[PDB]
Amino acid sequence: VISEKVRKALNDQLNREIYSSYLYLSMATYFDAEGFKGFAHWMKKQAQEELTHAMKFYEYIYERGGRVELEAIEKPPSNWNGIKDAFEAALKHEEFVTQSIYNILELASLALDHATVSFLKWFVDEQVEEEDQVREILDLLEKAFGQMSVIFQLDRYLGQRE
Amino acid sequence: MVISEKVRKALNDQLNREIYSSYLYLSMATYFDAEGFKGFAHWMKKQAQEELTHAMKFYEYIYERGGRVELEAIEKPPSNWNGIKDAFEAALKHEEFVTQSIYNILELASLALDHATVSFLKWFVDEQVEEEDQVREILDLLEKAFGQMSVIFQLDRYLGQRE
Ligand SMILES: [Ca+2]
Ligand SMILES: [Ca+2]
Ligand SMILES: [Ca+2]
Ligand SMILES: [Ca+2]
Ligand SMILES: [Ca+2]
Ligand SMILES: [Fe+3]
Ligand SMILES: [Fe+3]
Ligand SMILES: [Fe+3]
Ligand SMILES: [Fe+3]
């Protein structure tokens, strides 16, 4: 029932979620190497969340009578020059995902595909919220300047993510 | 007491092979879901998650021994097979090779006098053999069905119940 161009768009986004999951796990490998157990735990939770979103795209594609094709996953970066540098990359990554989602929303609307528009709305909202969470983290980091006190507070807080 | 670099390399290689395995199994789910076998598809998704849990077990052991993990590119998996049996044959061939891989690391760790790593791999060795034999039992059932839709579907319901 879903148009091939819209199915292709959802399949591209599914693969982007997978890569996104992988980047975060790679961010985990960096924080774990640097001894920040709380940051690494948060990244691992984020990787798990992105995987659940990919699976949401997976099952929606099959619900609309399409088919999922899994593409190569490129090697993610594994090193950053500081906690701030890592979260800068996450924000840059996340802004791009949001843009991609917006563009699929436009493609579905031109196709007059109501279901797909509705489906993507929840992800639009989740992406906006994630972007802001990363921004608030970077604001805290920039305002702390170097003070390790704030960096350990944030390791503790994020290490509690359920 | 931190792990040697070669034992580190091999565990990290195995970590990445558990990641590909998890992705391969998910790709098999895309095939069964497209062919209309919800039960087979469900089993492959469970297996893909389990392989991720194995990858993360390697992940945390490497850091416990003061090593680090490097994630490599994940190759595109096959997305199509010529039949239910063709898919499960590739699954068995994959798991067979993983079994030899685990035993290879086990000998390398012993050679390196790394009793901690040898003891860690024991659980995986033991579980790798069990699940290689579970995949062969499935594949054997489908060959003894030959054509029979009736038995293929009963397999689909069976694997569809995996918790
Ligand atoms: Ca994402
Ligand atoms: Ca293709
Ligand atoms: Ca646009
Ligand atoms: Ca979230
Ligand atoms: Ca198993
Ligand atoms: Fe996502
Ligand atoms: Fe995201
Ligand atoms: Fe395994
Ligand atoms: Fe396996």
Numbering used by the authors:
A (entry chain A): 3 to 164
B (entry chain H): 2 to 164
Q: Which text from the study accompanies this structure?
A:
Four helix bundles are also attractive for synthetic chemists because its interfaces are dominated by side chain and side chain interactions, which can be more tunable than β-strands. This study focuses on TmFtn, a naturally dimeric protein consisting of two antiparallel four helix bundles, as shown in Supplementary Fig. 1. Thermotoga maritima ferritin (TmFtn) naturally occurs as a dimer; twelve of these dimers interact with each other in a head-to-side manner to generate 24-meric hollow protein nanocage in the presence of Ca2+ or PEG. By tuning two contiguous dimeric proteins to interact in a fully or partially side-by-side fashion through protein interface redesign, we can render the self-assembly transformation of such dimeric building blocks from the protein nanocage to filament, nanorod and nanoribbon in response to multiple external stimuli.
We made a mutant named FLAL where Asn147 was replaced by aromatic phenylalanine (Phe) residue to create π–π interactions, while Glu112, Glu113, and Lys114 were replaced by three hydrophobic residues Leu, Ala, and Leu to decrease the electrostatic repulsion and increase the hydrophobic interactions between two adjacent dimers at the same time. To confirm this idea, we examined the FLAL self-assembly behavior in solution concerning Ca2+ and FLAL concentrations. Upon screening the concentration of Ca2+ and FLAL, we found that the optimal condition for the formation of filaments is [FLAL] = 48.0 μM and [Ca2+] = 80.0 mM, which is close to the Ca2+ concentration (50 mM) used for the above nanocage assembly. To obtain detailed structural information on the FLAL filament, we tried to crystallize this protein and eventually obtained qualified single crystals suitable for X-ray diffraction. The crystal structure was solved at a resolution of 2.1 Å. The side view of the crystal structure revealed that FLAL molecules arrange in a repeating, side-by-side fashion to form filaments. Further crystal analyses reveal that two adjacent FLAL molecules have opposite orientations, forming another interface along their C and D helixes. In the structure with resolutions that permit detailed analysis of side-chain configurations, Phe147 and Leu114 side chains at the designed interface adopt suitable conformations to generate π–π stacking interactions and hydrophobic interactions, respectively, again approving our design at an atomic level. Besides the designed noncovalent interactions, Leu112 and Val119 also produce hydrophobic interactions, which is unexpected. Additionally, one calcium ion occurs nearby the designed protein interface, which binds to Glu108, Asp127, Asn105, and one water molecule. We believe that the cooperation of these noncovalent interactions and metal coordination along the inter-building-block interfaces promotes the formation of the filaments.
